[PDB]
Amino acid sequence: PFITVGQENSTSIDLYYEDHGTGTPVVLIHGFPLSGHSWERQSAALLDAGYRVITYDRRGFGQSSQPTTGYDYDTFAADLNTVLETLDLQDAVLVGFSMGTGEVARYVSSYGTARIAAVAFLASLEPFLLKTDDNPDGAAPQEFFDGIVAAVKADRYAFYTGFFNDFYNLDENLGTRISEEAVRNSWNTAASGGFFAAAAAPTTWYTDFRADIPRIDVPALILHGTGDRTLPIENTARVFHKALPSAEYVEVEGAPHGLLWTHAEEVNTALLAFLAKAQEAQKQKLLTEVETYVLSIIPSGPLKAEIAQRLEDVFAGKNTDLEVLMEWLKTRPILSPLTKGILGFVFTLTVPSERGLQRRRFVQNALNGNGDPNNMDKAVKLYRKLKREITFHGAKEISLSYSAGALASCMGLIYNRMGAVTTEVAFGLVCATCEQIADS
Amino acid sequence: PFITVGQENSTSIDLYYEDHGTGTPVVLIHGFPLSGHSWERQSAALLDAGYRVITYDRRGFGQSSQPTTGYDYDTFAADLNTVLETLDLQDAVLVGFSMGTGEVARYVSSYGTARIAAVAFLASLEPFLLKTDDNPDGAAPQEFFDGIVAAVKADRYAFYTGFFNDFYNLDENLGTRISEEAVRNSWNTAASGGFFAAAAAPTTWYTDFRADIPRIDVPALILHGTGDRTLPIENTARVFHKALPSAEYVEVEGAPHGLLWTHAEEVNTALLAFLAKAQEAQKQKLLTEVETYVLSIIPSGPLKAEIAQRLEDVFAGKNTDLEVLMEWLKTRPILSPLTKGILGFVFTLTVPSERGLQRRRFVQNALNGNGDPNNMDKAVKLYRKLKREITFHGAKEISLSYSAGALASCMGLIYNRMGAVTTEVAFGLVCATCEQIADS
Amino acid sequence: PFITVGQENSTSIDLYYEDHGTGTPVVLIHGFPLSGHSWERQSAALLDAGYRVITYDRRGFGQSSQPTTGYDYDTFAADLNTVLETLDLQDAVLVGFSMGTGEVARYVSSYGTARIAAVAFLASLEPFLLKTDDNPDGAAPQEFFDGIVAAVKADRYAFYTGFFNDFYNLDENLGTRISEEAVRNSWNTAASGGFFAAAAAPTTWYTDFRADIPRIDVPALILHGTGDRTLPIENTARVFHKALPSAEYVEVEGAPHGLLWTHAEEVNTALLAFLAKAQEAQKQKLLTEVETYVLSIIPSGPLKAEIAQRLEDVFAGKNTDLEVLMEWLKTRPILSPLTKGILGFVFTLTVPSERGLQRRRFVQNALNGNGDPNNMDKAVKLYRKLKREITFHGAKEISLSYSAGALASCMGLIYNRMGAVTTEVAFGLVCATCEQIADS
Amino acid sequence: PFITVGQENSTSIDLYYEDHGTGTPVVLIHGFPLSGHSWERQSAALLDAGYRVITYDRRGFGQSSQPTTGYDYDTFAADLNTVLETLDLQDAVLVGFSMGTGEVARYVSSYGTARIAAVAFLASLEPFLLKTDDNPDGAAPQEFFDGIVAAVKADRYAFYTGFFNDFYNLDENLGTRISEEAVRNSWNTAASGGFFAAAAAPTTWYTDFRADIPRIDVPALILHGTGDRTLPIENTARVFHKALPSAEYVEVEGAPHGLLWTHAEEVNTALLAFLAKAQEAQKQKLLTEVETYVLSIIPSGPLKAEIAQRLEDVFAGKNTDLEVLMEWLKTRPILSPLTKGILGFVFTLTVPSERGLQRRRFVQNALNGNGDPNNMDKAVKLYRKLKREITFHGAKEISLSYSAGALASCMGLIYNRMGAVTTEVAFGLVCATCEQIADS
């Protein structure tokens, strides 16, 4: 699979990518000089944990196009922007490794955390690798990095051998945490890259990310191995942690630079923990908003309390039976049809195991919108706008411009499956629908 | 007249209804097995007392469609909801009889007292007719009602005869409080209903309204005859009063179930009294609304206080001289001509005993405004709509769509008596006229 | 069938009506408290006599809407005007009974005798029922009529029983001129009316029609029963006859107020006689139009005179032989085939005793229209239009839009019995066919 | 509810009708001089037995328009044709009573048994009522029927009293099988009819249906009471049975003419029996055709036998669980996806209790038709044709003109509910789909 991110001469610039699993999107950005396949230990684990795993190869790396231009983090982040927008990812988590951490920082800084839910930095470059007067916490001076580039140019293939020696800390880990064959594969992947990209990449390492750091508002994770030879812990993660004190800090003892493979177990644990915490965190702040809006239309009484409890339960993950819930709704007294319709919409949307229940008659007739063609016309016009929308807050504002009658029909369009909108947008509509009704 | 409330197969479900008189809306919901025309003695009285009478026939009864589905109080209340929304009734009073009391209870409970000002329950079913363990205050057990259903199914035409015998307490009241011809007509109305609806209706009588009662927040009236054979006073109204202590309780001595006709005099008296309280309450809220809107355009000062006092005085009924007020208005400094015009319009409209005073020059020239032909044309365009309008809330809503200049000219059209609109509508215009001026 | 005559609140005011038969329009306006179906004995007779019978129910009566407004003869006459204009009746005869006579007088006075050919007053109210100083020939004073209204308000259903007792003179006529079942039905019709209309109607009875009477210029008929209890002959018809001496005066001895049923034979005879003078007058004007049109296509000579004579003879009712006429037509040397066809069509259409004569070959071959499939298609399109049509002038106008070739084939459709149109419409077609031929 | 069947003058001719329940359509055609409501004893029973009950009032009867034309069985049958086509009824059963039997015979004869599944004749007129030389088995001569018409014309209301006396055999059945009130209601219904229609109807009774009888190919039922006074058993049903020996013959001992009410229990039993037998009979001949076609695509083996058995079971009414069936299908080896798709389509279509199962992923992906827009285009073109189609044999022929790929997508359109076609047509498509696949 490919995504076009540019054009170089007669050819176009496409990035190889992979989209696996179902759930919240987790984007994995590889490091030098490998490819998306490097994440295989994480990808396998993330898929088991019910996530949607998205990986892609940086330009001039792996199966991606190998142009001779655009090897800078402004272009790298621009490419990532294309990827996220092309796939239209929302509420996604960015995870970067080595070079990949730079892309995360720059994108967040340059494009905003609209589509972003959280960020993770594994074996980070941040904040600044270059050792200068203004930055004494740098790893090495300019002359040093110039040596690396010249080494790659000398013999690209022979360079890789020595590179992976310190990448994995082979003297320690070979035969223990990484096999001979595994390294062999890493080398093949390295050779598979672009000759130009190979020597162009090291110049990007001394990028000044110090200005990018403050723009990080989403929850963050900083992971790094103490035995990191490529990017010394004290010149990278430790000073990075001072720049971003809010971030969850994890130091893996004795882990090398390529800890993604060697210390995969420690990495997965920390990562899956951070993801699960950030996931439940964004569910609660979103669902409590949905709860208050939905409860706003239900008349005060013992029934209102009963509804709120069952709502909290499904939100908590207490997967209650849906056939029972829908029947409880259907046979419930004092509930208005529209209220039953709205709740029916919410329950099918929030309940995981859909079990296999047909779009209920009582829900469809509530959402039909009396059969007014004027209501059906406004509903489609709104549906077009919601297809473009991504944020929950953004979806509610544009929906509020429409009448309560038009909103009900729009919900009906989606429920009947004549419409395909994201859950965050779907929640925006229902809350906006509740808001208009609440003002009556 | 019909209102579509649903659809059954190839056919649609329409309810026959009637809309008479001008004033506060009073919805009359008939009982089994009659129709809206049963209220004729109350309707005649209510029309004389300056109310807006709305009656409709339940599905499968009278002139309404006779479907073979939807014979439950959730469907009955949904039908009522459609009627109220179709007519866009606001600050209305619901009055139910026999089965009709169930509709009132369920609607208020399920849809809220948004459009409702007050409720009345005559010969109520509430709270629960069924005699069970948890409900010993029931009138009769399950087996009994099963007998009635089977009795109707056996021969509904023969059933009606025996039914009306206890409905009117004919051994007592025939030839005294009800004539043979009156009963004869009632029988015709009964037979005119649906065969299915006839046997489907008794199953609804043992509905549990105990959960619906607490949701009644609007002022309530509970009326019931002591000689009620169909719905025994102690198993219905008396225990209903314990559930709803706020309600005005009236016990009509020796009255049967069909007291609407037999004891019509006692019923009208009690009902019109209860209604008058709700009527005078919203009349006052109308004048306070006009006051606040009119005062909104007057600039703050001692003159504003002076105007507000004279406004309160005329609203209170204090016979102020009109020639004096108008001469006072004409000679006031600080006041804009349009402001003087609006006030002049309000004063001629509200001040009693106009004593034959010719249309003031200063008011006519004030309302003319710009002299813009767009203002003049739209004013006539608006005037046509206002002649059809009847409600204050309805008149204010449609008037707001017009520019402030067009509204001023529209008031001028009416002032020159080239127009004839009701006082409630006239007030809608001035408030809308005041609203536009304040918002610029 | 309904005709909208106004609007009351959310509902519209529609009048139930019936349009039967083909010929000169006869409008039958019922009295209190019945409906259009009351004329059923007259309608049956009038339909036999080849009239177009139009009946409608007054507002709040029979199957018409039951509003609580517009119960005055100015509104009643306005409704009648709407009916006449909606149906676009021309040269029609108005026949009124009881209350219905008031509508006739008022409409004629207020709207003019433009569409009216003649008028009839059966059991009239005219000229003035109220007994005052200026009008001593009144039947009863103000106080009396106030009693009737109060009587209806007390119990309209019980009122109906006592009303029909004097309406039909049951002590005399029951079991002789009117059956128990017939009265039963009359009672049902009364109860079916509006409760408001019932008590509102009597106040209209003492309307002053004295100024309306002189405005009657069309030929008039005044019929009344001597045994009329409701409207005493001397206070009504006798003084009415002095006001309108030109009118044809008929006094049915011993007939009650509801003589329409009891003395139906005497009523029908008198009515059909008066009507026949106006009907035969309009039949001739139709036939003279057809004659001029048919003769228009025949070339000048002795033959033209012969045809005109034979046309006058069949129009006059002189039973000429058809077998002879057709053989005479077939054998003419200077007559065009189309001309022979048209005349043949006319003769079969106008000759009563067709005597079982088979569809002539020579006429069929003339009307076939050269068997052009294009001509045959246009003829069917016209036939569809003529199937909806009823008037002669209306049928002629829409036919003129078609080519002479298309018209001839359409006549062929009807002649061959592949088409079914009324005689008035059929004449419209033939006249339209002649007009096109005359213009070449 | 109304259906327009014609036009008379300014008015249109509409028939009042009722459509209740879900299942195979059973049309109930009332007799003289009643209306559709007369069937109430049958309608209640048929609805319990899960049928779709359709009743309508003949022109000039009940709530239908009352024109003065078209009172002949060619027009009556034309009206019935409009009703069946307007509602688009297919595989329906016609049931006639008294006059209603004539409509059934004529429609079948004139319009064919395309939409008809079976026919029933209760208290039939057939074959010929008129007593002449050529028909000695007639009930009465011409002069006799002329007497009946004149009796109605004499006094329509008084006629009904004597009519219902022999209609129900009141001397026997009154107070036993029919109540005083029930007859009263029948009289009201009689009076409700048209005055013209009342006297016009008896002339239709001596219609010669002898030519209509042979055209009856669908299964027939002839029911008649021996105590029938109106239509003597020997002059009607007995000679009718000789004309139609294939018909199921039922003689109800001592039943009068209006046995629909009096002997309702005996009538329902016989009728529900005949319907159930004719219903299962048309299911078997249709389903065995579906079975052979569906099995044609399944490869021979033990799986083929297993499928056939489960198919026979669901066809027999052995309502097996659908969640289990679909899971059995999904987890079944050797079954192709398209085969699983086709079977999935058939099972959801044939299984009554849908239970509430979502359109399965495995079924949708099989029916998608690879996503070719050309296949989706042809599928819609076919869908338009199938919407017009009614017969199973008719639906298969027009579908065969389309490719197997286009057919699969068309089935997918219906399954996803983007399409609404009748079950007989739906079966035509699947069989046609199987036929194309079978030829590969």
Mutation for testing the D interface, residue in B7, B8, B11 having most D CBs under 10 Å: B11
Angle between helices C73-86 and C100-111 in degrees, nearest 10: 70
* Domain closes at, from C279, C294, C315: C279
Does A165 share its domain with A286? no
Could you count the other beta carbons within 10 Å of the beta carbon of residue C9?
A: 20
* Domain closes at, from C245, C264, C279: C279
User: Residues 28-47, chain D: which have Cβ within 8 Å of B?
Assistant: 37, 40, 43-44, 47
* Domain closes at, from A309, A337, A366: A366
Angle between helices D180-191 and B180-191 in degrees, nearest 10: 80
Omega prior to C337 cis, within 30 of 0: no
How many angstroms away from the CA of A414 is the closest CA of chain B? 23
d(C-alpha B401, C-alpha B405), whole Å: 12
How many angstroms away from the CA of A370 is the closest CA of chain D? 20
Specify whether the CB–CB gap between A132 and A145 falls below 8 A. no
User: Residues 191-230, chain B: which have Cβ within 8 Å of C?
Assistant: none
D263 is catalytic: no
d(C-alpha D207, C-alpha D77), whole Å: 13
Does A271 share its domain with A396? no
DSSP-assigned states of every residue in B377-432: HHHHHHHHHHHH---HHHHHHHHTTS-HHHHHHHHHHHHTTS----HHHHHHHHHH
Does A262 share its domain with A385? no
Show residues of chain A in contact with D356, CB under 8 Å. 323, 356-358, 360
The verdict on a CB contact (< 8 Å) between C20 and D187 is no
* Identity of the residue numbered B205: W
User: Residues 135-194, chain B: which have Cβ within 8 Å of D?
Assistant: 153, 155, 157-158, 160-161, 187-188, 191
Tokens of A266: 């420690």
Approach to solving: X-ray
According to DSSP, the residues that pair with B96 across neighbouring strands are: B29, B121
Q: Do chains A and C touch (3 or more CB pairs under 8 A)?
A: no
Show residues of chain B in contact with D40, CB under 8 Å. 195
Specify whether the CB–CB gap between C127 and C102 falls below 8 A. no
Residue C310: CB partners within 8 Å, gap ≥ 6? C320, C325
Specify whether the CB–CB gap between C71 and C79 falls below 8 A. no
Specify whether the CB–CB gap between D346 and D290 falls below 8 A. yes
Host H or E run for residue A184: helix A180-191
d(C-alpha A251, C-alpha A234), whole Å: 11
The verdict on a CB contact (< 8 Å) between A299 and B212 is no
Which residue pairs, CB below 8 angstroms and at least 24 apart, start in D316-321? D317/D352, D319/D351, D319/D352, D319/D353, D320/D351, D321/D355
Host H or E run for residue D13: strand D11-20
Q: Residues of A354-372 as b/e, b for ≥16 C-beta within 10 angstroms?
A: ebbbebbeebebbbbbeee
Omega prior to A33 cis, within 30 of 0: yes
For A322, name the nearest residue in chain D, comparing CA atoms only.
D356
Mutation for testing the D interface, residue in A325, A327, A355, A361 having most D CBs under 10 Å: A355
Does A250 share its domain with A291? no
* Identity of the residue numbered A132: T
Which listed residue (D35, D38, D64, D98) is catalytic? D98
Angle between helices A40-48 and A264-297 in degrees, nearest 10: 40
- A335 in reach of chain B (CB within 8 A): yes
Host H or E run for residue B161: helix B156-167
Does B284 share its domain with B268? no
Does A18 share its domain with A86? yes
* Identity of the residue numbered C76: F
Nearest to D52 by CA among B9, B383, C68: B9
Q: How far is CA C153 from CA B50, C68, C203, in A?
A: 18, 14, 13
The verdict on a CB contact (< 8 Å) between B9 and D179 is no
* Backbone phi and psi for residue A286, each to the nearest 5 degrees, phi listed first: -80, -45
The verdict on a CB contact (< 8 Å) between B215 and A337 is no
Which residue pairs, CB below 8 angstroms and at least 24 apart, start in C164-169? C164/C190, C164/C258, C166/C229, C166/C230, C166/C256, C166/C257, C167/C229, C167/C230, C167/C256, C167/C257, C167/C258, C168/C256, C168/C257, C168/C258, C168/C261, C168/C262, C169/C227, C169/C229, C169/C256, C169/C257, C169/C262
Show residues of chain A in contact with D354, CB under 8 Å. 358
Range of the domain at A326: 280-366
User: What's the CA angle centered on A404, arms A401 and A410, to 5 degrees?
Assistant: 85
Which residue pairs, CB below 8 angstroms and at least 24 apart, start in A339-344? A339/A297, A339/A298, A340/A366, A341/A365, A341/A366, A341/A367, A341/A408, A341/A411, A342/A294, A342/A297, A342/A366, A342/A411, A342/A430, A342/A433, A342/A434, A343/A294, A343/A307, A344/A415
d(C-alpha C399, C-alpha C436), whole Å: 10
- D356 in reach of chain A (CB within 8 A): yes
d(C-alpha C142, C-alpha C146), whole Å: 6
d(C-alpha A391, C-alpha A397), whole Å: 10
CA C256 distance to own-chain centroid: 25
User: What's the CA angle centered on A291, arms A286 and A292, to 5 degrees?
Assistant: 105
3-state secondary structure of D426: helix
CA C164 distance to own-chain centroid: 28
Q: How far is CA C133 from CA C137, C140, C158, C202, in A?
A: 9, 12, 34, 21
Does B235 share its domain with B369? no
d(C-alpha B180, C-alpha D236), whole Å: 44
DSSP-assigned states of every residue in C269-334: HHHHHHHHHHHHHHHHHHHHHHHHHHHHHSPSSHHHHHHHHHHHHHHHT----HHHHHHHHHT-SS
Specify whether the CB–CB gap between D193 and D62 falls below 8 A. yes
Mutation for testing the A interface, residue in B7, B86, B109, B393 having most A CBs under 10 Å: B109
For tokens 């006092």, name the residue: B309
Does C328 share its domain with C412? no
User: Residues 308-327, chain A: which have Cβ within 8 Å of D?
Assistant: 323
Eight-class DSSP state of C113: S
* Domain CATH code at residue D316: 1.20.91.10
CA D387 distance to own-chain centroid: 20
According to DSSP, the residues that pair with D285 across neighbouring strands are: none
Specify whether the CB–CB gap between A128 and A135 falls below 8 A. yes
Specify whether the CB–CB gap between B393 and B90 falls below 8 A. yes
Count: domains in chain B: 3
CA atoms within 13 A on the CB side of B187: 24
Q: Which chains touch B (3 or more CB pairs under 8 A)?
A: A, C, D
C98 is catalytic: yes
Omega prior to B302 cis, within 30 of 0: no
Show residues of chain A in contact with D357, CB under 8 Å. 356-358
For D197, name the nearest residue in chain C, comparing CA atoms only.
C44
The verdict on a CB contact (< 8 Å) between C182 and D10 is no
* Backbone phi and psi for residue B233, each to the nearest 5 degrees, phi listed first: -45, -45
Specify whether the CB–CB gap between D311 and D291 falls below 8 A. yes
Could you count the other beta carbons within 10 Å of the beta carbon of residue C307?
A: 19
For tokens 């409630």, name the residue: B424
For A366, name the nearest residue in chain B, comparing CA atoms only.
B78
Does A351 share its domain with A375? no
- D18 in reach of chain B (CB within 8 A): yes
Show residues of chain D in contact with A357, CB under 8 Å. 356-358
Does C224 share its domain with C200? yes
DSSP-assigned states of every residue in C66-106: --SS--SHHHHHHHHHHHHHHTT--SEEEEEETTHHHHHHH
Specify whether the CB–CB gap between C348 and C323 falls below 8 A. no
The verdict on a CB contact (< 8 Å) between B68 and D20 is yes
Does C125 share its domain with C68? yes
Residue C307: CB partners within 8 Å, gap ≥ 6? C294, C295, C298, C343
d(C-alpha D296, C-alpha D298), whole Å: 6
Q: How far is CA C125 from CA A275, C129, C262, in A?
A: 94, 6, 20
C228 is catalytic: yes
* Domain CATH code at residue D440: 1.10.10.180
Show residues of chain B in contact with A301, CB under 8 Å. 214-215
d(C-alpha A45, C-alpha A49), whole Å: 6
Which listed residue (A228, A241, A399, A409) is catalytic? A228
* Domain CATH code at residue C269: 3.40.50.1820
Q: Residues of C189-208 as b/e, b for ≥16 C-beta within 10 angstroms?
A: bbbbbbbbbbbbbbebbbbe
For D326, name the nearest residue in chain A, comparing CA atoms only.
A356
d(C-alpha C423, C-alpha A63), whole Å: 90
Host H or E run for residue A118: strand A116-122
Residue A51: CB partners within 8 Å, gap ≥ 6? A21, A23, A24, A25, A26, A275
* Identity of the residue numbered B114: A
Does D122 share its domain with D227? yes
- A331 in reach of chain B (CB within 8 A): no
Tokens of D10: 């300014």
